[PDB]
Amino acid sequence: VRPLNCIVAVSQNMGIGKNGDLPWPPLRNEFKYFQRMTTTSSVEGKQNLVIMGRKTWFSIPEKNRPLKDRINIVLSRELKEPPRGAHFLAKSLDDALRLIEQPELASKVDMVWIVGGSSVYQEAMNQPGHLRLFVTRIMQEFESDTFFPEIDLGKYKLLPEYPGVLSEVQEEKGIKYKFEVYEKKD
Ligand SMILES: NC(=O)C1=CN([C@@H]2O[C@H](COP(=O)(O)OP(=O)(O)OC[C@H]3O[C@@H](n4cnc5c(N)ncnc54)[C@H](OP(=O)(O)O)[C@@H]3O)[C@@H](O)[C@H]2O)C=CC1
Ligand SMILES: Nc1nc(N)c2nc(CN3c4ccc(O)cc4C=CC4=CCC=C[C@@H]43)cnc2n1
Secondary structure: EEEEEEEEOOOOOOEEEEOOOOOOOOOHHHHHHHHHHHHOOOOOOOOEEEEHHHHHHHHHHOOOOOOOEEEEEOOOOOOOOOOOOOOOOOOOOOHHHHHOOHHHHHOOOOOOOEEHHHHHHHHHHOOOEEEEEEEEEEEOOOOOOOOOOOOOOOOOOOOOOOOOOOOOOEEEEEEEEEEEEEEEEE
C-alpha cells in the first residue's frame, strides 16, 4: 500500500485524451487489462484502491461507476461532497495518500492505483519514493489534447518482466499495443 502505482495507456505521440474521451476507438482488450491489474488484490478480504481526477471520474460511463470491486477516491478542489458512488473525496493528492495510510483502512486496502488524468499523473510523478508506472504503449499516433508526462529513463527502470504481465505485442481492431512496467525506487 506504500508503493504507488500509476496505470495509463499512451499513444506514440504521448497522447492520453481528446475532448474528455480517449484518442483511440474502444480497445476492450486493453480495458480488460486495466480492469485486471487495478482490481486484483494480493489478499482475500482487501480491495485495491483507485485515485482519479474529477474530470476522469465524470467521463467514465455512469453505468460503470464506481469502478467495481475497488475503493474509489476522487480528487477535486471545488466539490465539497464525494460524487454519488465515490467512496471518498480528497482536496489534494497528499490528503488522499495520508487517508489511505490511516489504520482504519489497514485491513481495508491492498494496492493503490492512480488511474488518471494528466494532472494527477504529473503530481504523482513529482513525488519522492516508490512509484511504478504500468504503461500500455499504443503503437500508433492519435490526435490528442491531454498527454502523459515524460518518462526519464535515468529515473525509471524498464522492468524486463513483471508478475502477471504478458510482454508480447497485442492487436485489436488493427491497432497494436504492448504492456510495460517501469519502476522508480527510494
Ligand atoms: N490511460 C488513459 O489513456 C487515460 C486517459 N485519460 C484522459 O485524461 C483526460 C483528462 O485529463 P485532465 O485534463 O488532467 O483531467 P483530470 O482527469 O485530471 O480531471 C480533472 C480534475 O482533477 C482534479 N485534480 C487534479 N489534481 C488535483 C489535486 N491535486 N487536488 C484536488 N483535485 C485535483 C481537478 O479538480 P478541481 O478542478 O476542482 O481543481 C480537476 O477538476 C480525459 O480526457 C481522459 O481522456 C484519463 C484516464 C486514463
Ligand atoms: N491502461 C489503462 N490505464 C488507464 N488508466 C485507463 N483509463 C481509462 C479511462 N476510461 C475508462 C475508465 C474506466 C472504464 O470502465 C471505462 C473507461 C472508458 C472510457 C473513458 C473515456 C474517457 C475518459 C476516461 C475513461 C481507460 N483505459 C485505460 N487503460
